[PDB]
Design a binder for this molecule. Structure first.
Ligand SMILES: Nc1ncnc2c1ncn2[C@@H]1O[C@H](COP(=O)(O)OP(=O)(O)OP(=O)(O)O)[C@@H](O)[C@H]1O
Lengths: 53, 370, 51, 377
């Protein structure tokens, strides 16, 4: 998982950007720098509590 | 029935206009160039031949240039052509001006020389010395030491044919004629419209001797009044760019401006100043002698009865414009056709003047008073 | 008659082909090259078809 | 009809001629290597991290990309806040990119020198003197100002009736400036995108700051949003932001520093109050209609090139011009030559100018210039 995480951050489509909001069914909504908003059913590899809206 | 020969000449001319690769070198360039090539701005030049190129997508990757004909023409702000996929500079930069500017250029003038115009001979003299004469005989101006006047304004009441003088200039001009209305700068986008004024002038400089006609200049520049309501016309910015082009730093090279306004008082003082309009031409309503020539020219190519008295119509009614004379001649022909006479009687001309002049009502009680 | 109707459906295999972009020609140059601006993109030099 | 046939026959002959007429190593080995060579799209670095650098770069509209350095690069060479080129396929900074020149701002710089001496401008010695110590003497000899401990104004506004000579003086300063002269295109500052022009104004000052001692000529200040009605409609909101950006960069929180600003306006009243306020523009050099000594001098300079009889009296001609701008006086000289050309006399005479003086002023609908009223004698 760590090797995939390193490759994805390095990859061009990582698109790091702020989370618009935090949701629970544990979920997140992220607006990428491309200005496209995506809702992820799983909040992500990083801890949900650690993540801040 | 000589019309058939004339129609054939027109069709043949269109056919002539319609009828207007290296074994290895061209084929190699054809392979090098993509089937689709996208043209984009050049931002930076690098000696390695990989030069940054700006694009609508903004991919500015340094890209190699391999132009067989020449690659030394690259300059900042040049529109380079790039492959759709590789994005390398394909070759010599595309060199075409904006489409709106292309429409203004005129290659054919329908009217002939100053012959059709009658009684504006003083006005013809001024336009010729400013426009036709400097090009035909440049030596006279140099010997005098005078630099030829480059700007003219034609101001007159409606229907004095200020445009006719401009059409006549187009008929006999070495210079490329760009015909742009003053009301053709309504660009909605903020900016763009002042930039279009810059575009028209840059093309004129590119074509070297050029004559610019701006009919109805009242719309582009009037008063330079304050924003007031705060709508902000932005037209004042457009006029200021024209003012800059005519005499605002640098030089105008060899471009001559002809401008026509029904009302000259409204026009802002800065635009109508020596250095932007060195010579000013006034078209007055035709008097008697000028009317005689115009009436003859309009009736020259129509059947005329001996009975008709051209002098009687001109002397009896005073105030009719040169255009009004043409309308009387067209109306008189229609009046005769009603009686099925191709020939035009004096009676027809008398009826015609009355019909054309029915909308012109002027004056109040200023009769007994003075 | 049945062959004709099924052949029309075989003709409908054409609907699958992707539509060509619609663009306005800014100007034309010689050697089968035209300058056409794409409707949402930028100027493209294109190779004219034989037709 | 036969003559028309001759032209049609000529066209047919041309048609027959057209139909009858119908009946470098770069393009070689280099192309084979060039097609494989990959592209590197430009992007701007914003930050760096410890251990794996993981530099995060905004492409220019795409996204913040966490791209590692390319294998064939030096980590020290890649720097924070530096333009870089990242290959899309390899997602790494293959080569760093040099800082953007921003050529449009570079284009406005005069670069060339207009060939007009101060001698050609005439009848405004006082206006020339005022410009000299805000443009040439402070830059050429700053020591004198320092000796009195007096700072130069560092700003100038030229205003006057149209055709007075405001721009002519400005081109003359450009000829002998001995420092960068930056003529500003007013239309260029207005831009389609919101505040895109405001970004350019920051660049204008940045370019000015990089060069040492430079003068920026904002001719037609009215074009650069020189008003602040700022109404609720806010039609000029984009330009108003551009104007304010110029005002702050001009002065406040560290001003021009070494930049002298020359602004020329036909209508001074329209200019926004904040720009008019001094500090932004300390001097207010208004150009004025020339006096009789000035009117004679402008006539003499304009007519020196023209061939004329040596006995002409410019003083009489200037007197006959009651209130004439320099351009109108130039118009009299050119018009006088045109009358001589009309009569085909190579050497002009005093009478030719008098006819021109009537033509340039009286013949124009001034009304005051042409007298039908006996009223006063
Ligand atoms: N004092 C003068 N000495 C010499 N030439 C002059 C003088 N005043 C005006 N001119 C002439 O007028 C023109 C110079 O006009 P200039 O470039 O100064 O713009 P302007 O008309 O004053 O500016 P604006 O349109 O903004 O009011 C040239 O033809 C120049 O020869």
């Amino acid at each position: 998982e760590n090797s995939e995480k390193i490759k994805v951050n390095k990859t061009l489509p990582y698109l790091v950007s702020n989370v618009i909001e935090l949701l629970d069914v544990k979920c997140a909504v992220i607006k990428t720098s491309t200005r496209q908003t995506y809702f992820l059913p799983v909040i992500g590899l990083v801890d949900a509590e650690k993540l801040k809206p | 029935l000589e019309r058939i020969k004339d129609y054939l000449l027109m069709e043949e001319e269109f056919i002539r206009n319609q009828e207007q690769k290296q074994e290895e070198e061209r084929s190699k360039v054809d392979d090098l160039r993509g089937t689709p090539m996208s043209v984009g701005t050049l931002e930076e030049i690098i000696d390695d031949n990989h030069a940054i190129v700006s694009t609508s997508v903004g991919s500015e990757h340094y890209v190699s240039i391999l132009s067989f004909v020449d690659k030394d023409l690259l300059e900042p702000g040049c529109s380079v052509l790039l492959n759709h996929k590789v994005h390398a500079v394909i070759g010599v930069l595309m060199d075409d001006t904006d489409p709106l500017v292309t429409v203004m250029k005129v290659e054919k003038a329908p009217q002939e020389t100053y012959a059709d115009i009658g009684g504006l001979d003083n006005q013809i003299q001024e336009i010729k010395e400013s426009v036709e004469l400097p090009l035909t005989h440049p030596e006279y101006y140099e010997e005098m030491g005078i630099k030829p006047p480059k700007g003219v304004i034609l101001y007159g009441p409606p229907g004095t044919g200020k445009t006719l003088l401009a059409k006549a200039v187009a008929n006999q001009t070495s210079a490329t004629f760009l015909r742009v209305v003053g009301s053709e700068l309504i660009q909605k986008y903020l900016g763009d419209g002042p930039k279009l004024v810059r575009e028209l002038f840059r093309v004129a400089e590119e074509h070297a001797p050029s004559i610019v006609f701006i009919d109805e200049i009242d719309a582009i520049g009037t008063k330079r009044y304050d924003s007031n309501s705060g709508g902000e016309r932005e037209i004042q910015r457009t006029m200021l760019e024209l003012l800059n082009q005519l005499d605002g730093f640098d030089s105008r090279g060899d471009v001559k401006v002809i401008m026509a306004t029904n009302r000259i008082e409204t026009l802002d003082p800065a635009l109508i100043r020596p250095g932007r309009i060195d010579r000013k031409i006034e078209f007055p309503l035709p008097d008697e002698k000028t009317k005689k020539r115009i009436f003859q020219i309009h009736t020259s190519r129509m059947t005329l009865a001996d009975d008709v008295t051209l002098d009687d119509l001109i002397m009896a009614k005073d105030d009719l414009s040169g255009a009004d004379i043409k309308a009387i001649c067209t109306e008189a022909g229609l009046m005769a056709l009603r009686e099925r006479r191709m020939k035009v009687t004096n009676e027809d001309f008398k009826k015609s003047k009355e019909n054309v002049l029915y909308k012109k009502q002027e004056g109040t009680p200023e009769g007994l008073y003075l | 008659l049945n062959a004709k109707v099924r052949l029309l459906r075989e003709e409908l295999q054409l609907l699958q082909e992707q539509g060509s972009y619609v663009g306005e020609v800014v100007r034309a140059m010689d050697k089968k090259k035209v300058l056409v601006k794409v409707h949402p993109e930028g100027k493209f030099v294109v190779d004219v078809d034989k037709n | 009809d036969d003559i028309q046939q001759l032209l049609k026959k000529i066209n047919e002959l041309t048609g027959i001629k057209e139909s009858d007429t119908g009946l470098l190593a770069a393009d070689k080995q280099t192309l084979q290597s060039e097609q494989p060579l990959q592209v590197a799209r430009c992007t701007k670095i914003i930050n760096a991290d410890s251990e794996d650098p993981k530099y995060i770069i905004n492409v220019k509209q795409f996204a913040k990309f966490v791209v590692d350095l390319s294998d064939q690069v030096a980590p020290t060479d890649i720097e924070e806040g530096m333009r870089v080129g990242v290959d899309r396929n390899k997602y790494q900074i293959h080569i760093p990119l040099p800082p953007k020149i921003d050529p449009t701002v570079t284009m406005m710089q005069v670069e060339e020198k207009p060939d007009v001496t101060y001698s050609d401008v005439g009848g405004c010695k006082e206006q020339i003197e005022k410009l000299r110590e805000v443009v040439e003497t402070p830059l050429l000899h700053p020591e004198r100002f320092v000796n009195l401990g007096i700072e130069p104004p560092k700003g100038v506004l030229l205003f006057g009736p149209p055709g007075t000579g405001k721009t002519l003086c400005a081109r003359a300063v450009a000829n002998r400036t001995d420092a960068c002269f930056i003529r500003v295109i007013g239309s260029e500052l207005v831009q389609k995108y919101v505040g895109e022009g405001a970004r350019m104004v920051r660049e204008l000052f940045e370019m000015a700051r990089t060069k040492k001692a430079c003068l920026i000529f904002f001719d037609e200040i009215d074009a650069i949003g020189g008003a602040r009605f700022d109404d609720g409609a806010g039609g000029d909101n984009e330009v108003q932001r551009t104007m304010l950006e110029l005002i702050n960069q001009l002065d406040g929180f560290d001003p021009r520093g070494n930049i002298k600003v020359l602004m020329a306006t036909n209508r001074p009243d329209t200019l926004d109050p904040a720009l008019m306020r001094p500090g932004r523009l300390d001097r207010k050099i208004e150009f004025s209609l020339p006096d009789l000594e000035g009117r004679t001098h402008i006539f003499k300079i304009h007519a020196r090139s023209m061939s004329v009889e040596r006995d002409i009296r410019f003083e009489l001609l200037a007197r006959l011009c009651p209130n004439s701008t320099g351009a109108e006086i130039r118009s009299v000289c050119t018009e006088a030559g045109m009358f001589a050309i009309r009569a085909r006399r190579k050497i002009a005479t005093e009478k030719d100018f008098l006819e021109a003086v009537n033509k340039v002023i009286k013949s124009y609908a001034k009304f005051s210039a042409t007298p039908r009223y006996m009223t006063y004698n």
